Amino acid sequence: MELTPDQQTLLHFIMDSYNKQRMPQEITNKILKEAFSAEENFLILTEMATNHVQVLVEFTKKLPGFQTLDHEDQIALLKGSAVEAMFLRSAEIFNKKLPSGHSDLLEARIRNSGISDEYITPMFSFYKSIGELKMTQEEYALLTAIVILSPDRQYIKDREAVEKLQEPLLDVLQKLCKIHQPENPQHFACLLGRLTELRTFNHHHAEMLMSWRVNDHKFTPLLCEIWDV
């Protein structure tokens, strides 16, 4: 029912590794400060996406048991979760409470960033769906770890070894759901449901970058490897 000392240890360790990320206030303040062209926003996106991959590899290496997995499976998990984890992190930043009228301006700035209108509606539908869940910092950290340690990822040789590492993270998350929302017993299932909505963003990620309203789509070598561009 309640968290065990081992689970609390796992939780604080996941929280410490996760907090090594970029400040949500820093990112939203830049977007809200002034309007940028589709070209400036494309450059901001590639820089933010390159840094996110680097921070994600460090968070993943610290995930208990990750370094014991086969080296090829290690790459397949990272390649399979990188884009999903970046969208989950954008949804987290999107739903952070801000002064009156700021989240309306943040939405309008993201709508006019340069992204193709075809992707605007599915993106905001996911962001709003995440927001309705009123997720805590610990829930975002554990859900990101669960997304990375997905055994049902493509090209995984040893799925059972991945399952063994994901299961204790799922157990901690379920206990937090029962504690933070005892009136909503559907909460844990709702979180796992939102992960299938995440997976549907992975299908058109390359197109989302290529269809950006710019003439030149320049990427860093690391981005070319993670996003398939």
Binding site: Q54, V57, K61, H71, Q74, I75, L78, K79, P221, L222, E225, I226
Partner: peptide, 11 residues
């Protein structure tokens, strides 16, 4: 061949 990712994982 994911050379940069392999490098970021190994060292």
């Amino acid at each position: 061949d994911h050379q940069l990712l392999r490098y970021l994982l190994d060292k």
